[PDB]
Structure 1
């Protein structure tokens, strides 16, 4: 008789009415499919044949049913059990007056990509859809650190105190770029752009990557993402990208693990009754962002949560478990256009926890669902995980890599002080300075007239007026 086990060998089931069983069995079936096709010498060409494939999929299922295989999962019994109780006990906190709210969460070890526990949904007995591994939804503004800022930093095109335009601008189709009811403001730092999740700065950042011919697909495909069209202007805001929570957790794993991707996995090994290893996970680490980039981004995402602009999470957690709230939490929120998907992705140096909520039919949630409800539910989820496994989150801090370049830059421009051409006239740009972190060799450039990411001529005239005002 075949068994699926937790990470410590405790049997989950013989080959039963929950996500854990069907998720791990589906994945073990897929690994058995690959093993049996390779064993029978069936080529990837032969496997293109629809009837041969159907047969091999059936053979795989039956082989587990009838064999005596042991399937070792990465799942930590105590932790995953605590996560189930947390959703059973506190899932109702998600209900925001837009009907029953669905949820998915994946908890992943940053150093291995192992999935220690997950939440598939509110209640498998009422709704079987698996929101952790099956349902794909736009990751909304949580795309910004990975595909816009992280890449721009990694390419030496931005530092931590770089200024970006948030002046009003339009998309290619002529529509204004919006952030709720705001058509935009003026210049702002990268930290302010992240903390608020403004949209225009991320639009400009990605425009810059396109203009510069940056291989964005290279980064994203190294983390396992599949995006059909990389020219989409709203990609940083989650346009043109749909992901599972387990996949997206893996992108935040990469940033938390100092830029080093490990592939997510729930199966570590499948053995025959006699011990023959028929499948084993093989770690293939990839340095997707430099250590400088990742560690700079960790410092920025720490402030996203502490600032409490887009999520109440740190307030909810400091109440529930003040000691755990003092662990080194970093994270990012997302909200889709009509409030159809809310995300909160969280990490400590040891673990990453992804969280989505939304409705199976894509109807809107309430305006506050992601800011407050999901934050409060995820604070309960994190507490429950720590209650189950007291050291699992860890007490380590994220810290800048030694390879980070520190540049003294003007607050106003985010570039080094120097002379600048303004309206036909050299001007000595002077004033108060801040340390800005870079991931290139030479750090920040000298200040130039177009000192910010993005902006029209009119925007710069308005901005320079204001700076020159200060000198």
Structure 2
């Protein structure tokens, strides 16, 4: 092993790669490998091979960074305790251009709890699902732009239960920016509904990033319902958005060599343009504001006080939470790296309402600071920027669509007013304003909306 959680995680992955190598070496057929007994033998053989084989296992781990991350959770992990008991944590630091994992946090203390919350435990991604499964895909399909309007008007699930956001049943129309900054749920619900109505191959996008979702026909899918992922895997999703839409598979083992040089295994990069560069860079701009607005996370404030120069780097991110309060997430990225973070309880009991907003945000600011102190230039000073392929459209702030004539239950009203630039990832850009100008909304909602617009 080159460069306790670290040892067991590295060992476990190396054993899996050794297993594949040995089975292939011995010419074991795909069928004879389906045998449970045979599988057990080869898994044990792989373990023994490493145990005393003198193999050279090269990992992607940056010693100084990983060590700094361990000292950080040791000294600052208590900042996560919010009064709902011992709060567990998982973090993964990933290189955006390669998918290599430079370091991670498996939990509060291995000696007290061996559960690896960075590589093994699967939890709902909650609201961090939105940029990837809903808004990102809608933008990529040319179904919406950066300033498109969405409905946050009250609405119910198919069973009559209202879609909630804390104790709020909703408000009204809002821009994608506001929807993302606050992480309102109804707009996400409508967006996914729109994708299914248009028959978009959502599964295709997610599978290209390695996500395994068993059922896509779920109303709350955009809010993380029906999805369970490890921090490592989810960090890979944000790595994709940060790396201008190009996915690079996560990995901790880069190569395994026998003592004599024979290559037992070696990571092979297989980049995939999941989202267009236009879509990815537009999302980066929206996620930059999610952090700057400080609506769902105090992160920017925390980091500014701890390391103002590092806070000036081009940070973008998204928080994750649901009405259940069982999982809090904060995904952060600079052009060079992505750091995923999850906190919660092993038995899934609820965290305090502000555990994600304050506690996890402060802890992660300390974690980010520790990483930078250990490796000064690792985060980078590069800026995320709009790809030149991005189409810019001048639209009304009220409708998120180009100015024009619209029929409002009689009479041809000339919809005009203040405008703003909206970014699109299609060819023609934003369409002319129509009566149903927003994503989602009932007939009544639109009556109320247009009443104000005209008013």
1:421 Cα deviation (Å)?
1.1
**1:347-367 residue CA offsets vs partner (Å, 9 max, x unmatched):** 000000000000000010011
Q: Tell me, what secondary structure is at the counterpart of 2:41?
A: helix
The count of residues paired between Structure 1 and Structure 2 equals 455
Distance 1:68 1:349 in 2: 38
**Native 8 Å contact 1:138 1:336 kept in 2:** no
TM-score, normalization by structure 1:
0.96
Whole-Å separation in 2 of the counterparts to 1:33 and 1:337 = 42
Aligned with 1:48: secondary structure? Answer: coil
State the distance in 1 between where 2:226 and 2:429 align: 33
Which digits, 9 at most, give the CA deviation of each residue in 1:100-153, with x for residues without a partner? 000000000000000000000000011000000000000000000000000000
The worse-fitting range, judged by mean Cα deviation, of 425-434 and 371-380 is: 425-434
Q: TM-score, normalised to structure 2's length? A: 1.00
User: 2: CA distance between counterparts of 1:435 and 1:79?
Assistant: 41
Structure 2 counterpart of 1:308, from 277, 287, 294: 294
Deviation digits for residues 290-312 of structure 1 (CA, Å, limit 9, x no counterpart): 00000000000000000000000
C-alpha displacement of 1:424: 2.3
Residues in 2 aligned to 1:403 and 1:42: alpha-carbon distance in whole angstroms: 49
| SS in structure 2 of the partner of residue 46 of structure 1 | coil
Whether contact under 8 Å (1:33, 1:60) holds in the other structure is yes
Q: Following TM superposition, by how much is the alpha carbon of 1:46 offset from its aligned partner in structure 2, in angstroms?
A: 1.2
Where does residue 382 of structure 2 map in the other structure?
396
Aligned partner of 2:408 in structure 1 is: 422
State the alpha-carbon separation in 2 of the partners of residues 381 and 155 from structure 1.
Answer: 36
Deviation at 1:337, TM superposition (A): 2.5
Measure, in 2, the Cα distance between the counterparts of 1:172 and 1:42. Answer: 50
Which of 267, 270, 273 aligns to 1:284? It is: 270
Q: Deviations over 1:381-403 (max 9, x none)?
A: 00000000000000000000000
Do the aligned residues in 1 keep the contact of 2:189 with 2:222 (CA within 8 Å)? Answer: yes
Is the contact between residue 164 and residue 201 of structure 1 (CA under 8 Å) also seen in structure 2? yes
Tell me the distance in 2 between the aligned counterparts of 1:133 and 1:437. 36
5+ residue gaps in structure 1?
7-17
d(CA) in 2 for partners of 1:58 and 1:267? Answer: 20
Superposed displacement of residue 426, structure 1? 1.3
Residue 425 of structure 1, CA deviation: 1.9
CA deviation string 1:274-327 (max 9, x = no partner)? 011110000000000000000000000000000000000000000000000000
State the secondary structure of the residue aligned to 1:357. Answer: strand
Partner deviation per Cα, 1:228-277 (whole Å, 9 max, x = no partner): 10011111100000000000000000000000000000000000000111
Is the contact made by 2:164 and 2:323 (CA closer than 8 Å) also made in structure 1? no
Aligned partner of residue 424 in structure 1, secondary structure: coil
After TM superposition, the structure 1 stretch with the greater mean CA deviation from structure 2, 283-292 or 61-70, is: 61-70
Q: Which residue of 1 aligns with 2:42?
A: 56
What's the CA shift for 1:19? 0.2
For residues 234 and 433 of structure 1, the distance between their equivalents in structure 2, rounded to whole angstroms, comes to 33
Runs of 4+ in 1 over 2 A off after TM superposition: none
Is 1:30 equivalent to 2:27 in the alignment?
no
Deviation, 1:23, is 0.1
User: Deviation of residue 336 (structure 1)?
Assistant: 2.8
